[PDB]
Every structure is written in structure tokens, then in C-alpha cells.
């Protein structure tokens, strides 16, 4: 046999609408239509029958779904948006039929994310209801969340060290960087009584999942970027220029639906001759810039 019926979803703007990529487990890249908050979602549900038989059903519907999935657990899925359009009443199908759909000005409060303990995804779900086993078709989309240049962006500047051994002033030009922005900074040495072999600047991504004492923090070191080779003396200034566009990062997501945070940290690391490692971590907010 095969399937008696196949469900395809064709958007009205399918030719002209931009698409985007998503990184998934084992380095896979899927590509889905791009959407924004406030956009209407509209198109055709196209039913392709395959057999010369008849399909009895207890209704056909299409849903727009936005959901947060935790730990790959199906009992721990949370829909934060669900919109329904009923496309057919209970009845039969003997021959191919298309059904129009429009979801007006669809709210899409969060950006799509695929992580370790968290998925956030948006999709169109078509359901042909049947007596013991529905015919279900999902159809994934990507939602981006855009933000203008921030009102307050101050430089990060800090004196830090180990007493009577190492004292340094570090400066990073912003606290908030866009996804293709540049960390411009410097490291200034005030006291050096330790023997420093090298210094690197690392971008660390923390994914925080759960509620209250239920907290799981996954930590991934996205870049290790060398900024000094060899031993400095006091009064020395080391320049930093680190381009964020080389590492393909997600925005900073903070307390999304009260279920997860995705946060970014600049971790400055100095290493001595005996391989001892001195560090300072500083949060930076990443944001998706809107093109004009």
C-alpha cells in the first residue's frame, strides 16, 4: 500500500519569503522560512490522496503552534502560542483537495532556539482526525526577535587581580554587542610579579534551564582568542579586537517564558609558566540587530 493521503503545506509568499538556517545535533543544518513577530501566516494545505479508496475522517484542522520543549521530554512541552483554523467538518475524502488558511497578525514573542536541554520552535501542524490514529503533519518555521540600538550602552571597565602579585585594568568598549559586532578593548598591566606565558579572551555561552532550585546550567566555550604572547611588564597595554561574526552566536535570551536563559560571557584568561590559570568572567548581552 503506502499512505492513503499525504499532507503538504504551501505558503502564499513561498517564492519571495526569506529562509534561514538552524544548527542541530551532530552538526546538521536545517533550513526553514523566516518569520517575525506580528506577521500574518497564510497559505494552502494541499492534500494529495494516493490510493483509489476513501478516507473517512472526524475533521481536518490546521494549527499555528509555538512551544518550548525541555530535556527532550514530551511531558515537559509547553505551548506558549496555539491558534486553530478548522478546515473541514467530519466526512469523507475521495479525491485531492486544497484548503486555504490565514492566521491574522500572529504574535511571536520569542526567537527560535535549539540547545542542549531546550528547544524553542514554531510550526504549522495539520491534523486529519481519524477513529484510532490521526494523520499529522508538522511544518517548522523560524522566528527572529529584533532589537534597535540600546539607549544605555556603557563600556565595561574593571581593575582586578591577585594581591601583591598581579593587578590589571581591563576595558571592553560596550556591555551590549550585536551578533556581527566587534569586541574592541584593551588590557592594561599595573602590577606584574608573576611570569605570564600568554593571555586569551574567551566567549562562553551558558544555557540555564529550570525553575528555582531545579537549575541545570550547560556551558560551552565558543571561542578561545589569543591576545598576548609572552610576559608583559607594568605600564604595558595590550589591544583587543575580536570579531563576533566569525563564531555564529545566538542572542542573549533572558528568562524566556520563565523556563530558560541563554547568556554570554567574556572570560579573560592569563596563564603562567607552570600552567596556572587566572581569569575574570564578565557578562555581555548579545542582540540581533535589525537591518534597515
Amino acid at each position: 500500500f503506502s499512505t492513503p493521503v499525504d499532507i503538504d503545506i504551501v505558503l502564499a509568499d513561498a517564492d519571495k519569503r526569506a529562509m534561514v538556517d538552524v544548527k542541530l545535533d551532530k552538526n546538521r543544518r536545517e533550513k526553514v522560512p523566516l518569520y517575525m513577530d506580528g506577521e500574518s501566516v497564510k497559505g494552502c494545505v494541499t492534500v494529495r490522496p494516493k490510493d483509489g479508496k476513501r478516507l473517512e475522517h472526524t475533521g481536518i484542522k490546521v494549527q499555528f503552534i509555538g512551544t518550548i520543549e525541555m530535556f527532550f521530554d514530551r511531558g515537559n512541552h509547553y505551548e506558549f502560542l496555539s491558534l486553530v483554523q478548522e478546515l473541514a467538518a467530519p466526512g469523507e475524502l475521495q479525491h485531492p483537495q486544497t484548503f486555504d488558511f490565514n492566521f491574522k497578525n500572529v504574535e511571536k514573542q520569542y526567537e527560535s532556539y535549539n540547545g542542549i536541554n531546550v528547544k524553542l520552535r514554531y510550526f504549522v501542524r495539520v491534523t486529519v482526525s481519524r477513529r484510532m490514529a490521526d494523520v499529522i503533519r508538522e511544518k517548522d518555521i523560524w522566528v527572529y526577535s529584533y532589537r534597535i540600538p540600546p539607549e544605555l550602552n556603557s563600556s565595561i571597565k574593571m581593575d582586578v587581580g591577585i594581591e601583591d602579585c598581579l593587578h590589571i585594568e581591563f576595558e571592553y568598549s560596550k556591555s551590549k554587542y550585536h551578533l556581527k559586532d566587534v569586541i574592541v578593548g584593551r588590557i592594561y598591566f599595573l602590577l606584574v610579579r608573576l611570569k605570564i606565558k600568554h593571555m586569551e579572551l574567551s566567549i562562553i555561552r551558558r544555557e540555564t534551564t529550570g525553575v528555582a532550585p531545579n537549575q541545570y546550567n550547560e556551558s560551552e566555550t565558543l571561542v578561545r582568542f589569543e591576545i598576548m604572547d609572552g610576559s608583559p611588564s607594568r605600564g604595558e597595554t595590550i589591544p583587543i579586537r575580536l570579531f563576533l561574526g566569525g563564531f555564529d552566536l545566538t542572542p542573549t535570551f533572558r528568562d524566556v517564558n520563565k523556563k530558560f536563559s541563554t547568556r554570554y560571557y567574556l572570560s579573560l584568561v592569563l596563564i603562567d609558566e607552570d600552567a596556572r590559570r587566572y581569569f575574570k568572567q564578565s557578562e555581555i548581552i548579545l542582540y540581533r540587530q535589525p537591518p534597515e
Binding site: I162, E163, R276, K280
Partner: peptide
């Protein structure tokens, strides 16, 4: 294995 020391503010 490799020692990791947090740098304190002054």
C-alpha cells in the same frame, strides 16, 4: 588538574 584562580576586584 590545571589550577583556576578568580581575579578579585580592588
Amino acid at each position: 588538574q590545571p589550577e583556576l584562580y578568580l581575579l578579585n576586584t580592588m
